[PDB]
Each structure stands twice: as structure tokens, then as C-alpha cells.
Amino acid sequence: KGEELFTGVVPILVELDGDVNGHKFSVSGEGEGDATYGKLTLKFICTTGKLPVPWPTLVTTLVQCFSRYPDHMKQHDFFKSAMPEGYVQEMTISFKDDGNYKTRAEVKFEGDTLVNRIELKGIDFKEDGNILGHKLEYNYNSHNVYITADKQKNGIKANFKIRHNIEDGSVQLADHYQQNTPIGDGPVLLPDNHYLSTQSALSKDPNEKRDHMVLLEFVTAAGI
Ligand SMILES: [Mg+2]
């Protein structure tokens, strides 16, 4: 059973290949998760050079199996129930008045390591918009990820709106539509409606010259 794999600290690897308006890039991340505390600590590096989009726009794409599900809600934790075989996570991320990302990720164990492998495609971004113009602040607001069951796909859907702070005081909305489906043929937990309360802090490694992001995140299930 999947939740048993998450009682301790688990190493995490994240590998993303991206193309946004023909700008090709890759990101590699390493860190660890401790679902007992809903806690993630990761460092991401752009391995191809400078990142052509703002780091905050990639946070939702770059492992909700590390959410803390309170004991009384453990029957609603799809994400761990799909492990170790894993799940596919697909998102459409619609940036208001701008372009969109489409992502497809596979999240699964490789040995004792939780791996998130992602392909991201971004299209129809404005050259001097907040994304390609790098007008987003290097910070991150707290959000609720609203989860519903998708019985016919044996999985879940999520809907939420990320509020990215713009450097002039305004907000760039990024609407998210998410679908997750198990990779394996074993049974999974199909949840009642609930949400994940997520808090994220972005920072820099003072000794790192590559383009990078240090992320500390807490994710807690609620709403039941
Ligand atoms: Mg077109």
C-alpha cells in the first residue's frame, strides 16, 4: 500500500524538458519530501542556461504525494495510493491575457526515489507580456488546490487559480485545470471533494551561479 512508502524522508528527483514559444530549456531538481509534515525542500537548476520564463511560473509543474493528509482524511489520498507504480499528471495552465502551458508528467518511484518527469509546452505568449518579459516577482502566494474525483478515469481532477505577483503591484492569474490518472492497475483511493492548502517560499543559493530556484513548500489536505 502506497501510503506506507511515505512515512519517512524520501529523496526526490525532478526532470523537466520545456519549449515555450520555441525557447527550449531543461530543469533538473533534487531534494526531499517528508509527507508526515507535508514538507518539501528542493533545489532546481536550469541546465541549458538562463530560464526563458520566470521561475514562479514553473512551481506547479515541478509531487502532491508529499501532501500531509490528516489521519481522518487518509481515505482521500489518491496520490499516495497510486504508488509505487505512480500517476500521470496533465495540466493546462492558462495565463490570463497571455499564453498557456500544457504539461504531461509521470510521477513514480525509481527504487526508493520519487521521480517527477515532465514535458512542458507553452504557446501564444506575448513577447512583452509578464511571462516572456520577466515581469513577475520572485515570490509565491498561498493557494488552495481543489480536488474532485474522476471516477470514470479512476483518478482525480483539480482546479485552482494561481495569483502571480507582478512587479508593478498587479496580479497575473494562471488558471489551472489538472487531471491525474494512475499508471498501475491496482486500486486507488477516489476522494470526496477537498482541497490542498499550499504555502511556498522561493529563495536563492548564495553560492550558485547557475540560474536556479530553492523551494520550501508545505502542503496540507483539508476541507473534510
Ligand atoms: Mg496559432
Coordinates of N, CA and C and ligand atoms in Angstrom, one line a residue:
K1 N 0.8 -1.2 0.0 CA 0.0 0.0 0.0 C 0.8 1.3 0.0
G2 N 0.4 2.2 -0.9 CA 1.1 3.4 -1.2 C 1.6 4.2 0.0
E3 N 0.7 4.5 0.9 CA 1.0 5.5 2.0 C 2.2 5.0 2.8
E4 N 2.4 3.7 2.9 CA 3.5 3.1 3.7 C 4.8 3.6 3.1
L5 N 4.9 4.0 1.9 CA 6.2 4.5 1.3 C 6.6 5.9 1.7
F6 N 5.7 6.5 2.4 CA 5.9 8.0 2.7 C 6.0 8.3 4.2
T7 N 6.2 7.3 5.0 CA 6.3 7.5 6.5 C 7.6 8.2 6.9
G8 N 8.6 8.2 6.1 CA 9.9 8.8 6.3 C 10.3 9.9 5.3
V9 N 11.5 10.3 5.3 CA 12.0 11.3 4.3 C 12.3 10.5 3.1
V10 N 11.9 11.0 1.9 CA 12.0 10.4 0.6 C 12.8 11.3 -0.3
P11 N 13.9 10.8 -0.9 CA 14.6 11.6 -1.9 C 13.7 11.9 -3.1
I12 N 13.8 13.1 -3.7 CA 13.0 13.5 -4.9 C 14.0 13.9 -6.0
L13 N 13.7 13.5 -7.2 CA 14.3 14.0 -8.4 C 13.2 14.5 -9.3
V14 N 13.5 15.7 -9.9 CA 12.5 16.3 -10.9 C 13.3 16.6 -12.2
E15 N 12.8 16.2 -13.3 CA 13.4 16.5 -14.6 C 12.3 17.0 -15.6
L16 N 12.5 18.2 -16.1 CA 11.6 18.9 -17.0 C 12.3 19.2 -18.3
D17 N 11.6 18.9 -19.4 CA 12.0 19.5 -20.7 C 10.9 20.4 -21.1
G18 N 11.2 21.6 -21.5 CA 10.3 22.6 -21.9 C 10.5 23.3 -23.2
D19 N 9.5 23.7 -23.8 CA 9.5 24.6 -25.0 C 8.4 25.6 -24.8
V20 N 8.8 26.9 -24.7 CA 7.8 28.0 -24.6 C 8.1 29.0 -25.7
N21 N 7.1 29.0 -26.7 CA 7.3 29.9 -27.9 C 8.6 29.6 -28.6
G22 N 9.0 28.3 -28.6 CA 10.2 27.9 -29.3 C 11.5 28.1 -28.5
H23 N 11.4 28.6 -27.3 CA 12.5 28.7 -26.4 C 12.6 27.3 -25.7
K24 N 13.7 26.6 -25.9 CA 13.8 25.3 -25.4 C 14.7 25.3 -24.1
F25 N 14.3 24.6 -23.1 CA 15.0 24.6 -21.8 C 14.7 23.3 -21.1
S26 N 15.5 22.9 -20.2 CA 15.5 21.9 -19.2 C 15.9 22.4 -17.8
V27 N 15.2 21.7 -16.9 CA 15.4 21.9 -15.4 C 15.5 20.6 -14.8
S28 N 16.5 20.6 -13.9 CA 16.8 19.4 -13.0 C 16.6 19.8 -11.6
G29 N 15.9 19.1 -10.8 CA 15.7 19.3 -9.4 C 16.1 18.1 -8.5
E30 N 16.6 18.4 -7.3 CA 16.9 17.4 -6.3 C 16.4 18.0 -5.0
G31 N 16.0 17.1 -4.1 CA 15.7 17.4 -2.7 C 15.0 16.2 -2.0
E32 N 14.1 16.6 -1.1 CA 13.5 15.5 -0.3 C 12.1 16.0 0.2
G33 N 11.3 15.0 0.4 CA 9.9 15.2 0.9 C 9.7 14.4 2.2
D34 N 8.9 15.0 3.1 CA 8.5 14.3 4.3 C 7.0 14.6 4.5
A35 N 6.2 13.6 4.0 CA 4.8 13.8 3.9 C 4.2 13.9 5.3
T36 N 4.8 13.3 6.3 CA 4.4 13.4 7.7 C 4.1 14.9 8.1
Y37 N 4.9 15.8 7.5 CA 4.9 17.2 7.8 C 4.4 18.0 6.6
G38 N 4.0 17.3 5.5 CA 3.6 17.9 4.3 C 4.7 18.8 3.7
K39 N 6.0 18.4 3.9 CA 7.1 19.3 3.7 C 8.0 18.9 2.5
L40 N 8.3 19.8 1.7 CA 9.2 19.7 0.5 C 10.4 20.7 0.6
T41 N 11.6 20.2 0.3 CA 12.7 21.1 0.2 C 13.5 20.6 -1.1
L42 N 13.5 21.6 -2.1 CA 14.1 21.3 -3.4 C 15.0 22.4 -3.9
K43 N 16.0 22.0 -4.7 CA 16.7 23.0 -5.5 C 16.7 22.6 -6.9
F44 N 16.3 23.5 -7.8 CA 16.1 23.4 -9.2 C 17.2 24.2 -9.9
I45 N 17.7 23.6 -11.0 CA 18.8 24.3 -11.8 C 18.3 24.2 -13.3
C46 N 18.4 25.3 -13.9 CA 18.2 25.3 -15.4 C 19.5 24.8 -16.0
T47 N 19.5 23.7 -16.6 CA 20.8 23.0 -17.1 C 21.1 23.5 -18.5
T48 N 20.2 24.3 -19.1 CA 20.5 24.7 -20.5 C 21.0 26.1 -20.6
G49 N 21.0 26.8 -19.5 CA 21.4 28.2 -19.5 C 20.5 29.1 -18.7
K50 N 20.1 30.2 -19.2 CA 19.1 31.1 -18.5 C 17.7 30.5 -18.8
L51 N 16.9 30.5 -17.8 CA 15.5 30.1 -17.9 C 14.7 31.2 -18.7
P52 N 14.0 30.8 -19.8 CA 13.3 31.8 -20.6 C 11.9 32.2 -20.1
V53 N 11.5 31.7 -19.0 CA 10.3 32.1 -18.3 C 10.6 32.4 -16.9
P54 N 9.8 33.0 -16.1 CA 10.0 33.2 -14.7 C 9.9 31.9 -13.9
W55 N 10.8 31.7 -13.0 CA 10.8 30.5 -12.1 C 9.4 30.3 -11.5
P56 N 8.7 31.3 -10.9 CA 7.5 31.1 -10.3 C 6.4 30.4 -11.2
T57 N 6.5 30.6 -12.5 CA 5.6 30.1 -13.4 C 5.7 28.5 -13.5
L58 N 6.8 28.0 -13.0 CA 7.0 26.6 -13.1 C 6.8 25.8 -11.8
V59 N 6.4 26.5 -10.7 CA 6.3 25.8 -9.4 C 5.3 24.7 -9.5
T60 N 4.1 25.0 -10.0 CA 3.0 24.0 -10.0 C 3.4 22.8 -10.9
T61 N 4.2 22.9 -11.9 CA 4.6 21.8 -12.7 C 5.7 21.0 -12.1
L62 N 6.7 21.7 -11.5 CA 7.8 21.0 -10.8 C 7.3 20.3 -9.5
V63 N 4.3 17.2 -7.1 CA 4.5 15.9 -6.3 C 3.6 15.9 -5.1
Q64 N 2.3 15.9 -5.4 CA 1.3 16.1 -4.3 C 1.1 14.8 -3.5
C65 N 1.8 13.8 -3.8 CA 2.0 12.6 -2.9 C 2.7 13.0 -1.6
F66 N 3.4 14.2 -1.6 CA 4.0 14.6 -0.3 C 3.1 15.5 0.5
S67 N 1.8 15.7 0.1 CA 0.9 16.4 1.0 C 0.7 15.7 2.3
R68 N 0.5 16.4 3.4 CA 0.0 15.8 4.6 C -1.5 15.7 4.6
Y69 N -2.0 14.4 4.6 CA -3.4 14.1 4.7 C -3.6 13.8 6.2
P70 N -4.4 14.6 6.9 CA -4.7 14.2 8.3 C -5.3 12.8 8.4
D71 N -5.0 12.1 9.5 CA -5.4 10.8 9.7 C -6.9 10.6 9.3
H72 N -7.8 11.5 9.7 CA -9.2 11.4 9.5 C -9.5 11.5 8.0
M73 N -8.6 11.9 7.2 CA -8.8 12.1 5.7 C -8.0 11.1 4.9
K74 N -7.3 10.1 5.5 CA -6.4 9.3 4.8 C -7.0 8.5 3.7
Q75 N -8.3 8.2 3.8 CA -9.0 7.5 2.7 C -9.2 8.4 1.5
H76 N -8.8 9.6 1.5 CA -9.0 10.5 0.4 C -7.7 10.8 -0.3
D77 N -6.6 10.1 0.0 CA -5.3 10.4 -0.6 C -5.0 9.6 -1.8
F78 N -5.5 10.1 -2.9 CA -5.3 9.4 -4.2 C -3.8 9.2 -4.5
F79 N -3.1 10.3 -4.3 CA -1.7 10.5 -4.8 C -0.8 9.3 -4.2
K80 N -0.8 9.1 -2.9 CA 0.0 8.0 -2.4 C -0.5 6.7 -2.7
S81 N -1.9 6.6 -2.9 CA -2.5 5.3 -3.2 C -2.0 4.7 -4.6
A82 N -1.6 5.6 -5.5 CA -1.2 5.2 -6.8 C 0.3 4.7 -6.8
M83 N 1.0 4.8 -5.7 CA 2.4 4.5 -5.6 C 2.6 3.0 -5.2
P84 N 3.6 2.4 -5.6 CA 4.8 2.9 -6.3 C 4.7 3.1 -7.8
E85 N 3.7 2.5 -8.5 CA 3.6 2.5 -9.9 C 3.4 3.9 -10.5
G86 N 2.7 4.8 -9.7 CA 2.7 6.2 -10.0 C 1.4 6.6 -10.7
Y87 N 1.5 7.9 -11.1 CA 0.4 8.5 -11.8 C 0.9 9.5 -12.9
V88 N 0.0 9.7 -13.9 CA 0.2 10.7 -14.9 C -0.5 12.0 -14.4
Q89 N 0.2 13.1 -14.5 CA -0.4 14.4 -14.2 C -0.4 15.3 -15.4
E90 N -1.5 15.7 -15.9 CA -1.6 16.6 -17.0 C -2.3 17.9 -16.6
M91 N -1.7 19.0 -17.0 CA -2.3 20.3 -16.7 C -2.4 21.2 -17.9
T92 N -3.4 22.0 -17.9 CA -3.5 23.2 -18.8 C -3.4 24.4 -17.9
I93 N -2.4 25.2 -18.1 CA -2.2 26.4 -17.3 C -2.4 27.6 -18.3
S94 N -3.5 28.3 -18.1 CA -3.9 29.4 -18.9 C -3.6 30.8 -18.2
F95 N -2.6 31.5 -18.7 CA -2.2 32.7 -18.2 C -3.1 33.8 -18.7
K96 N -3.9 34.5 -17.9 CA -4.9 35.5 -18.3 C -4.2 36.5 -19.2
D97 N -4.8 36.8 -20.3 CA -4.4 37.8 -21.3 C -3.0 37.4 -21.9
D98 N -2.7 36.1 -21.8 CA -1.4 35.7 -22.4 C -1.5 34.2 -22.8
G99 N -0.4 33.5 -22.9 CA -0.3 32.2 -23.4 C -0.6 31.1 -22.4
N100 N -0.4 29.9 -22.8 CA -0.7 28.8 -22.0 C 0.4 27.7 -22.0
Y101 N 0.5 27.0 -20.8 CA 1.3 25.8 -20.8 C 0.4 24.6 -20.8
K102 N 0.9 23.6 -21.5 CA 0.3 22.2 -21.4 C 1.4 21.3 -20.9
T103 N 1.1 20.6 -19.9 CA 2.1 19.7 -19.3 C 1.7 18.3 -19.2
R104 N 2.6 17.4 -19.3 CA 2.4 16.0 -19.0 C 3.6 15.4 -18.2
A105 N 3.2 14.9 -17.0 CA 4.2 14.4 -16.1 C 3.9 13.0 -15.7
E106 N 5.0 12.2 -15.4 CA 4.8 10.9 -14.8 C 5.5 11.0 -13.4
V107 N 4.8 10.7 -12.4 CA 5.3 10.7 -11.0 C 5.3 9.3 -10.5
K108 N 6.5 8.7 -10.1 CA 6.5 7.4 -9.7 C 7.8 7.1 -9.0
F109 N 7.9 6.0 -8.3 CA 9.2 5.6 -7.7 C 10.1 4.9 -8.7
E110 N 11.4 5.3 -8.6 CA 12.5 4.6 -9.2 C 13.4 4.2 -8.1
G111 N 13.3 2.9 -7.7 CA 13.8 2.5 -6.5 C 13.2 3.2 -5.3
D112 N 14.0 3.7 -4.4 CA 13.5 4.4 -3.2 C 13.3 5.9 -3.5
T113 N 13.5 6.4 -4.7 CA 13.4 7.8 -5.0 C 12.1 8.1 -5.8
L114 N 11.5 9.2 -5.3 CA 10.3 9.7 -6.0 C 10.7 10.6 -7.2
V115 N 10.3 10.3 -8.4 CA 10.7 11.0 -9.6 C 9.5 11.6 -10.2
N116 N 9.6 12.9 -10.6 CA 8.7 13.6 -11.4 C 9.3 14.0 -12.7
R117 N 8.9 13.4 -13.8 CA 9.4 13.6 -15.1 C 8.3 14.4 -15.9
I118 N 8.7 15.5 -16.5 CA 7.7 16.4 -17.1 C 8.2 16.8 -18.5
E119 N 7.2 16.9 -19.4 CA 7.3 17.7 -20.6 C 6.3 18.9 -20.6
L120 N 6.8 20.0 -20.9 CA 6.0 21.3 -20.8 C 6.1 21.9 -22.2
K121 N 4.9 22.3 -22.7 CA 4.8 23.1 -24.0 C 4.0 24.3 -23.7
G122 N 4.7 25.5 -24.1 CA 4.0 26.8 -23.9 C 3.8 27.4 -25.3
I123 N 2.7 28.0 -25.5 CA 2.4 28.6 -26.8 C 1.6 29.9 -26.6
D124 N 1.7 30.8 -27.6 CA 1.0 32.0 -27.7 C 1.2 33.0 -26.6
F125 N 2.5 33.0 -26.1 CA 2.9 34.0 -25.2 C 3.3 35.3 -25.9
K126 N 2.9 36.4 -25.3 CA 3.3 37.8 -25.7 C 4.7 38.1 -25.4
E127 N 5.4 38.6 -26.4 CA 6.8 38.9 -26.3 C 7.1 39.8 -25.1
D128 N 6.2 40.8 -24.9 CA 6.4 41.8 -23.8 C 5.4 41.6 -22.8
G129 N 4.8 40.4 -22.7 CA 3.9 40.1 -21.6 C 4.7 39.8 -20.3
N130 N 3.9 39.5 -19.2 CA 4.6 39.3 -17.9 C 5.5 38.1 -17.9
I131 N 5.2 37.1 -18.7 CA 6.0 35.8 -18.7 C 7.3 36.0 -19.5
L132 N 7.2 36.2 -20.8 CA 8.4 36.3 -21.6 C 9.1 37.7 -21.3
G133 N 8.4 38.7 -20.8 CA 9.0 39.9 -20.4 C 9.6 39.8 -19.0
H134 N 9.5 38.7 -18.3 CA 10.1 38.6 -16.9 C 9.7 39.7 -16.0
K135 N 8.4 39.9 -15.8 CA 7.8 40.9 -15.0 C 7.2 40.4 -13.7
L136 N 7.4 39.1 -13.5 CA 6.9 38.5 -12.2 C 7.9 38.5 -11.1
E137 N 7.4 38.9 -9.9 CA 8.2 38.9 -8.7 C 8.7 37.5 -8.4
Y138 N 9.8 37.4 -7.7 CA 10.3 36.1 -7.3 C 9.8 35.8 -5.9
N139 N 8.5 35.4 -5.9 CA 7.8 35.1 -4.7 C 6.6 34.2 -5.0
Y140 N 5.8 33.8 -4.0 CA 4.7 32.9 -4.3 C 3.7 33.0 -3.2
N141 N 2.4 33.1 -3.6 CA 1.3 33.2 -2.7 C 0.8 31.8 -2.3
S142 N 0.1 31.8 -1.2 CA -0.6 30.6 -0.7 C -1.9 30.3 -1.4
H143 N -2.2 29.1 -1.8 CA -3.3 28.7 -2.6 C -4.0 27.4 -2.1
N144 N -5.2 27.3 -2.4 CA -6.0 26.0 -2.3 C -6.1 25.3 -3.6
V145 N -5.7 24.0 -3.7 CA -5.9 23.2 -4.9 C -7.2 22.4 -4.7
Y146 N -8.2 22.6 -5.4 CA -9.5 21.9 -5.2 C -9.6 20.6 -6.0
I147 N -9.7 19.5 -5.2 CA -9.6 18.2 -5.8 C -11.0 17.6 -5.8
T148 N -11.3 16.9 -6.9 CA -12.6 16.2 -7.1 C -12.2 14.8 -7.7
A149 N -13.0 13.8 -7.5 CA -12.8 12.5 -8.1 C -13.3 12.6 -9.5
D150 N -12.5 11.8 -10.3 CA -13.0 11.5 -11.7 C -13.1 10.0 -11.8
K151 N -14.3 9.5 -11.5 CA -14.5 8.1 -11.3 C -14.2 7.3 -12.6
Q152 N -14.6 7.9 -13.7 CA -14.6 7.2 -15.0 C -13.1 7.0 -15.4
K153 N -12.3 7.9 -15.0 CA -10.8 7.7 -15.3 C -10.1 7.1 -14.1
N154 N -10.8 6.7 -13.1 CA -10.1 6.1 -11.9 C -9.1 7.1 -11.3
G155 N -9.4 8.4 -11.3 CA -8.4 9.3 -10.9 C -9.0 10.5 -10.3
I156 N -8.4 11.7 -10.4 CA -8.8 12.9 -9.9 C -8.7 14.1 -10.9
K157 N -9.4 15.1 -10.6 CA -9.2 16.4 -11.3 C -9.0 17.5 -10.2
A158 N -8.3 18.5 -10.7 CA -8.1 19.6 -9.8 C -8.3 20.9 -10.6
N159 N -8.8 21.9 -9.8 CA -9.0 23.2 -10.4 C -8.5 24.2 -9.4
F160 N -7.8 25.2 -9.9 CA -7.3 26.3 -9.0 C -6.8 27.4 -9.8
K161 N -6.6 28.6 -9.2 CA -6.1 29.8 -9.8 C -4.9 30.2 -9.0
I162 N -3.7 30.3 -9.7 CA -2.5 30.8 -9.1 C -2.5 32.3 -9.5
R163 N -2.2 33.1 -8.5 CA -2.0 34.5 -8.5 C -0.6 34.9 -8.4
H164 N 0.0 35.2 -9.6 CA 1.4 35.6 -9.6 C 1.6 37.1 -9.4
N165 N 2.4 37.5 -8.4 CA 2.6 39.0 -8.2 C 3.4 39.5 -9.4
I166 N 2.9 40.6 -10.0 CA 3.7 41.4 -11.0 C 4.4 42.5 -10.3
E167 N 5.6 42.9 -10.9 CA 6.5 43.8 -10.3 C 5.9 45.2 -10.1
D168 N 4.8 45.5 -10.7 CA 4.1 46.8 -10.6 C 3.0 46.8 -9.6
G169 N 2.8 45.8 -8.8 CA 1.7 45.6 -7.9 C 0.5 44.9 -8.4
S170 N 0.4 44.6 -9.7 CA -0.8 43.9 -10.2 C -0.6 42.4 -10.1
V171 N -1.5 41.6 -10.6 CA -1.5 40.2 -10.5 C -1.7 39.6 -11.9
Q172 N -0.9 38.6 -12.1 CA -1.0 37.7 -13.3 C -1.7 36.4 -12.9
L173 N -2.9 36.2 -13.3 CA -3.6 35.0 -13.0 C -3.2 33.8 -13.9
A174 N -3.0 32.7 -13.3 CA -2.7 31.4 -14.1 C -3.8 30.4 -13.7
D175 N -4.8 30.2 -14.5 CA -5.8 29.3 -14.2 C -5.3 27.8 -14.5
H176 N -5.5 26.9 -13.6 CA -5.0 25.5 -13.7 C -6.2 24.6 -13.8
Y177 N -6.2 23.7 -14.8 CA -7.0 22.5 -14.9 C -6.1 21.3 -14.9
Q178 N -6.3 20.4 -14.0 CA -5.4 19.3 -13.7 C -6.2 18.0 -13.8
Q179 N -5.5 17.0 -14.4 CA -6.1 15.6 -14.3 C -5.0 14.6 -14.0
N180 N -5.3 13.7 -13.0 CA -4.3 12.7 -12.7 C -5.0 11.3 -12.8
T181 N -4.2 10.4 -13.4 CA -4.7 9.0 -13.6 C -3.6 8.1 -13.2
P182 N -4.0 6.9 -12.6 CA -2.9 6.0 -12.2 C -2.2 5.3 -13.4
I183 N -1.0 5.0 -13.2 CA -0.2 4.2 -14.1 C -0.4 2.8 -14.0
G184 N -0.5 2.3 -12.7 CA -0.7 0.9 -12.4 C -2.2 0.5 -12.5
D185 N -2.4 -0.8 -12.4 CA -3.7 -1.4 -12.4 C -4.3 -1.7 -11.1
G186 N -3.6 -1.4 -10.0 CA -4.1 -1.6 -8.7 C -5.1 -0.6 -8.3
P187 N -5.9 -0.9 -7.2 CA -6.9 0.0 -6.8 C -6.3 1.3 -6.2
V188 N -7.0 2.4 -6.4 CA -6.6 3.7 -5.9 C -7.8 4.2 -5.1
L189 N -7.4 5.3 -4.3 CA -8.4 5.9 -3.5 C -9.0 7.1 -4.3
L190 N -10.4 7.0 -4.4 CA -11.1 8.1 -5.1 C -11.7 9.0 -4.1
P191 N -11.2 10.3 -4.0 CA -11.6 11.1 -2.8 C -12.9 11.8 -3.0
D192 N -13.6 12.2 -1.9 CA -14.5 13.2 -1.7 C -13.8 14.6 -2.0
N193 N -14.7 15.5 -2.3 CA -14.2 16.9 -2.6 C -13.4 17.4 -1.4
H194 N -12.2 17.9 -1.6 CA -11.4 18.5 -0.6 C -10.4 19.4 -1.2
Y195 N -9.6 20.0 -0.4 CA -8.5 20.8 -1.0 C -7.2 20.6 -0.3
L196 N -6.1 21.1 -1.0 CA -4.8 21.1 -0.5 C -4.4 22.6 -0.3
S197 N -4.1 22.9 0.9 CA -3.6 24.2 1.3 C -2.1 24.2 1.1
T198 N -1.6 25.1 0.3 CA -0.2 25.0 -0.1 C 0.5 26.4 0.2
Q199 N 1.6 26.4 0.8 CA 2.4 27.5 1.0 C 3.8 27.3 0.5
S200 N 4.4 28.3 -0.2 CA 5.7 28.1 -0.9 C 6.6 29.3 -0.7
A201 N 7.8 29.0 -0.4 CA 8.8 30.1 -0.3 C 10.0 29.9 -1.2
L202 N 10.3 30.9 -2.0 CA 11.3 30.8 -3.0 C 12.6 31.6 -2.5
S203 N 13.7 31.0 -2.8 CA 15.0 31.6 -2.4 C 16.1 31.3 -3.4
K204 N 17.3 31.8 -3.1 CA 18.5 31.6 -3.9 C 19.6 31.0 -3.0
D205 N 20.4 30.2 -3.6 CA 21.6 29.7 -3.0 C 22.7 30.7 -3.2
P206 N 23.3 31.3 -2.2 CA 24.2 32.4 -2.4 C 25.5 31.9 -3.1
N207 N 25.7 30.6 -3.1 CA 26.9 30.1 -3.8 C 26.7 29.6 -5.2
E208 N 25.5 29.8 -5.7 CA 25.2 29.2 -7.0 C 25.1 30.2 -8.1
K209 N 25.9 30.1 -9.2 CA 26.0 31.0 -10.3 C 25.0 30.6 -11.4
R210 N 24.6 29.3 -11.4 CA 23.6 28.9 -12.4 C 22.3 29.5 -12.1
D211 N 21.4 29.6 -13.1 CA 20.0 30.0 -12.9 C 19.3 28.9 -12.2
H212 N 18.6 29.3 -11.1 CA 18.2 28.2 -10.2 C 17.1 28.8 -9.3
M213 N 16.4 27.9 -8.5 CA 15.4 28.2 -7.6 C 15.5 27.2 -6.4
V214 N 15.5 27.7 -5.2 CA 15.4 27.0 -4.0 C 13.9 27.1 -3.5
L215 N 13.3 26.0 -3.2 CA 11.9 26.0 -2.9 C 11.7 25.2 -1.5
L216 N 10.9 25.8 -0.6 CA 10.4 25.2 0.6 C 8.9 25.3 0.5
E217 N 8.3 24.2 0.6 CA 6.8 24.1 0.4 C 6.2 23.2 1.5
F218 N 5.0 23.7 2.0 CA 4.2 22.9 2.8 C 2.8 22.7 2.2
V219 N 2.3 21.5 2.2 CA 1.0 21.2 1.6 C 0.2 20.3 2.6
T220 N -1.0 20.7 2.9 CA -1.8 20.1 3.9 C -3.2 19.9 3.3
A221 N -3.7 18.7 3.3 CA -5.1 18.4 2.9 C -6.1 18.9 4.0
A222 N -7.2 19.4 3.5 CA -8.2 20.0 4.4 C -9.6 19.9 3.7
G223 N -10.6 20.3 4.4 CA -11.9 20.6 3.8 C -12.9 19.4 4.0
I224 N -12.5 18.5 4.8 CA -13.4 17.5 5.3 C -13.4 17.4 6.8
Ligands
MG1 MG -1.5 29.9 -33.7

